[PDB]
Structure formats: C-alpha cells, structure tokens
C-alpha cells in the first residue's frame, strides 16, 4: 500500500481581463492539503487540511516564496512557448504541470515523475529513469535541448528522491489519523418508476475513502454492466466520496437483483438489494 505526494501547476494567459493566473495545489494521496492562487487578495501558500495548521510561519513563509518564484517562471514560459509555436500575441493559452513521487510500504521510492502540457496536449516529460526526456512535438524538443545541455534532469531526481520522499514521509505523520484511515462505503438501493412502465434500481455508495471503488449489478452471479448506467466518483466535499450505478428492471422483479460493492475499507465485498 503505497502513498504519494503530488503537486499540480496551472498557468493561463487571460487577454480581455488581466495578467496570467497561476494556481498550485498539493495532494497527499487523495487529499489536498496545500494551496496557492495568484488571483487571491494577497497570494500565499495556505493549508487545506486540519493537520497542516500547526506547521508555523517558518514553513508557510518559505513555501510562498517558492510558489511566487514559479508564478514568475510560468508567465515567462507562457510567452516563450508562444514564440516556439509562432502564435499570435494576445492569445489565451494554458500551461499545466504535475510532479511528485510514489513511495511504497517499505520506504522506497517506487516511481518519480514530472510532466507538463501546453493547451491540454503533452509537452515535455521526465522519463521513469529520471535521466531522460520525452518531447511530444518540436517545441518540447527545443525545451529538451536546453535542459539536456543544462543537465536539468539531475536536479530533478535529486528532489524526487530526497526532499519529495522525506516531506511526504512527515506529511503522513502530521495527518496519520486522517491519511491512514479507510472509511468503507455505506451502500443502499432506491426505486424509481419510469414512464415506460418498468422501474430503475439505483445503488448508492456514500462516505467512503479512498476514492477507488467498484459497483456492479448482479442477477445471481451474472453481470449487466453493458446495459447499465455509471456515474464518475464525485467528492462529497467533506473528505469522502460518493458514487452510484443504475439498471432498468421490469416491475415486480426488484428484489431479484443485487449490487456488488468493492472497496478497501470493506472486509469482503457488499451485496445490497432492494428492501
């Protein structure tokens, strides 16, 4: 059971309104704990988790410093890529980046990564070897060349193996009774008549963490998944997640069907039916 510390960067040139907006969010597993937004009254790194609110001015003053550093790097990079692709001056483009590390049960770095994208399409990416680069197009190749000469990949794997692993290791400590939890799904079934004369069975799953889950409607062991209706897992905005799936069923047959819930927090999978 591995854990992970990840960061997400975003820059958007906004002609018609103002200057480029920069947004930085940090995640430990499926829980954001930190935030920076350059559209704030006075942009600074802020906690988004109760277990981060005791770090002290030391940490936050330093994190803000780095966040502002990247806000400036990014609005400079925004202009640079426009020149690479030979695009118009007052355009609206996006640059986003994700870096971080997966650290597994023993303490070992499982995988380190750092990839970015220009306007929703891949740009340059650090390979898993933490030594080479993949360039999606010609412009990324330009950037790659400038980074291979500057030996920039070496500074990356330095971070991804040291600072990243260590601070993740202590972020886990600060929020151990919240990050190492495993709240199981609380499932139930609802019944909803259709105009067609049949009914809809909907199986909910509520208040579970982490987010990865599976719902499957059954008929005594047999599946009905490619005539079903799924819904992508959504945040309840409280630290847990929700999801449901539905099937159409002829009137009267309601109790004949069972929905199978699969999640980590459960000892063994659920099987909810209409009651």
């Amino acid at each position: 059971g591995s854990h992970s510390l990840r960061y997400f960067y975003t820059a958007v040139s906004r002609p018609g309104l103002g200057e480029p907006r920069f947004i930085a969010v940090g995640y430990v597993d499926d829980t954001e704990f930190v935030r920076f937004d350059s559209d704030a009254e006075n942009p600074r790194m802020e906690p988004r988790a109760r277990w981060m609110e005791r770090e002290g001015p030391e940490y936050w003053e330093q994190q803000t410093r780095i966040a502002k550093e990247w806000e400036q790097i990014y609005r400079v990079d925004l202009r640079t890529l426009r020149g690479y692709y030979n695009q118009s001056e007052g355009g609206s483009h996006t640059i986003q980046e994700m870096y971080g590390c997966d650290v597994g049960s023993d303490g070992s770095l499982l995988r380190g990564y750092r990839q970015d994208a220009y306007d929703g399409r891949d740009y340059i990416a650090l390979n898993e070897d933490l030594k080479t680069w993949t360039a999606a197009d010609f412009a990324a190749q330009i950037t790659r060349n400038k980074w291979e000469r500057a030996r920039y990949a070496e500074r990356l794997r330095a971070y991804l193996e040291g600072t990243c692993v260590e601070w993740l290791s202590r972020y886990l400590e600060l929020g151990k009774e919240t990050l190492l939890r495993s709240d199981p799904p609380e499932a139930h079934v609802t019944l909803h008549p259709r105009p067609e004369g049949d009914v809809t069975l909907r199986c909910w799953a509520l208040g579970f963490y982490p987010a990865d889950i599976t719902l499957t409607w059954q008929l005594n062991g047999e599946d009905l998944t490619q005539d079903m209706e799924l819904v992508e897992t959504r945040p309840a905005g409280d630290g847990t997640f929700q999801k449901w799936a539905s099937v159409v069923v002829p009137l009267g047959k309601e109790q004949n069907y069972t929905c199978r819930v699969e999640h980590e927090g459960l000892p063994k999978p659920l099987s909810q039916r209409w009651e």
Partner: peptide, 12 residues
C-alpha cells in the same frame, strides 16, 4: 514541499 533550486533557471 514545493520543488526549488533555483539558480539552474528551470525556464522552458
């Protein structure tokens, strides 16, 4: 902790 160095530039 956010990544930093930053004298290596890190400009694209």
């Amino acid at each position: 902790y956010l990544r930093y160095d930053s004298d290596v530039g890190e400009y694209r």
